[PDB]
Design a protein around this ligand. Sequence first.
Ligand code: NAG
Ligand code: NAG
Ligand code: NAG
Ligand code: NAG
Ligand code: NAG
Ligand code: NAG
Lengths: 238, 99, 148
Amino acid sequence: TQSYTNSFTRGVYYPDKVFRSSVLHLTQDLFLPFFSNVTWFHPVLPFNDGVYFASTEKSNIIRGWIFGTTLDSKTQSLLIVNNATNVFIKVCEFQFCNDPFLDVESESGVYSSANNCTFEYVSQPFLMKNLREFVFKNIDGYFKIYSKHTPIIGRDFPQGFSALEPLVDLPIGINITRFQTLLALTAGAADYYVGYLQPRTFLLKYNENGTITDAVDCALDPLSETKCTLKSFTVEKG
Amino acid sequence: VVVLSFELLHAPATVCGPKKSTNLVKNKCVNFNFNGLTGTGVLTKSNKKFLPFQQFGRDIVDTTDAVRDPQTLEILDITPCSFGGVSVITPGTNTSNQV
Amino acid sequence: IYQTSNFRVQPTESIVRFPNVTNLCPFHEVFNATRFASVYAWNRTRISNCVADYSVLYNFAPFFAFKCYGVSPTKLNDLCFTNVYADSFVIKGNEVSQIAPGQTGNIADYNYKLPDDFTGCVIAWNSNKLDSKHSGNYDYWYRLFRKS
Ligand SMILES: *[C@@H]1O[C@H](CO)[C@@H](O)[C@H](O)[C@H]1NC(C)=O
Ligand SMILES: *[C@@H]1O[C@H](CO)[C@@H](O)[C@H](O)[C@H]1NC(C)=O
Ligand SMILES: *[C@@H]1O[C@H](CO)[C@@H](O)[C@H](O)[C@H]1NC(C)=O
Ligand SMILES: *[C@@H]1O[C@H](CO)[C@@H](O)[C@H](O)[C@H]1NC(C)=O
Ligand SMILES: *[C@@H]1O[C@H](CO)[C@@H](O)[C@H](O)[C@H]1NC(C)=O
Ligand SMILES: *[C@@H]1O[C@H](CO)[C@@H](O)[C@H](O)[C@H]1NC(C)=O
């Protein structure tokens, strides 16, 4: 609860659909800096330019997220719940209840009522220990839900490198200055993390098949910036 | 009596003109337009391994050289049409007029 | 030996490709559905997030006074939009003539007044026996003289 842990090298996502083979591409984008500083959980979390979420809960409690300006039946809000059948996305107002917990069935427990609604999207359920990562970018009006599922066993925050794939860029564009997590029902096993993205420059390595297998930050230390200047992963004496 | 009262709210929805796709041709210097990507070249069969979410192929100098067909998910390698210089070999015009 | 000019192979034809169109609008059944309301409570469903297929509109059942108040019908095939409202109602042909943006006359200002801007186009054709009672359809009502 409100702990702290270094982020190591995690939170790298594909910036575009372009296919590249055995190159080294230097890109400027919103990223999570290497060895950053995240807050372990075990919530009034604000939204600034995008967040990183990497819960490893065995259950599906923390599922659901609310985005908007006032997060009330005054400005349009969102809702993304991914249960065993289908994931539902609404873009309309919902008067918030006392707590953001599911009554269990999906209306009164978390909010008051649904009124003056608009575009609603559905798709296959997102779910498929089960390390699930998200990147909630909202550049322009095409809300991005970059994600990657790694059910590989690990620690509370293990090491390694793995990239994140896109999901959809829905036509939104309402004001999202504040966001909030949801949960289904405090002192619980709410093992989830938050990491704020930031403008940064990276040097990505593509294998011949076309997957990002490595990366180096360009502002972490002198060696890193030297690598970025030479556009290589090895440096000779000089 | 029925109306079709339209309204465009910033970003247009998927309601748009039907996409008048045509046939596909290969091994011929042709113009092309793959989902808004223009250019001219020769379209052949490719050995690329596109992941299920890319659309284009980019080389070192960032010139497109592989495109996936939107109708059927197939990757096509492209190549510019032939070009080059022309040189004329002649003896003196005092000698003859053959080249 | 002199270098004079350059040679270039000319393109032979043209080509253009796009994905499967699909995404049909579930609103064609609004057209030719004798119970598409009568005058007042038109089907609030609107044509949105599918296709702007206006080609079938002109090749539909023969209209009598199909009037487009927007852009020319020829270009309506490919212009993109976001949402398209559809009002389902039945009136008289003289009322169809009376229907215009910011116009008076019976239903045009008493039952369902057309929008002042009216970014849209009405499509009207004769119904007759489709929704007429043998003794006179008294179930259908119209405002003879509304307050304003
Ligand atoms: C993270 O932030 C906390 C408080 O802001 C600070 O004590 C700590 O040194 C920072 N770095 C790490 C690696 O936790
Ligand atoms: C969005 O909401 C914030 C407060 O939540 C406000 O300060 C801001 O002016 C609003 N508009 C934009 C464009 O950020
Ligand atoms: C998943 O949530 C939807 C949203 O209401 C609900 O209709 C559906 O029944 C839920 N799935 C199950 C298995 O209850
Ligand atoms: C939704 O639209 C109705 C009808 O225009 C309007 O009265 C209402 O204030 C809007 N907002 C809500 C939250 O109902
Ligand atoms: C890409 O394809 C090659 C050829 O089959 C294979 O050797 C390589 O492991 C693949 N890389 C992946 C799937 O990341
Ligand atoms: C597009 O239509 C053709 C026509 O039969 C079909 O073969 C093809 O599978 C369709 N594309 C997709 C992605 O379903």
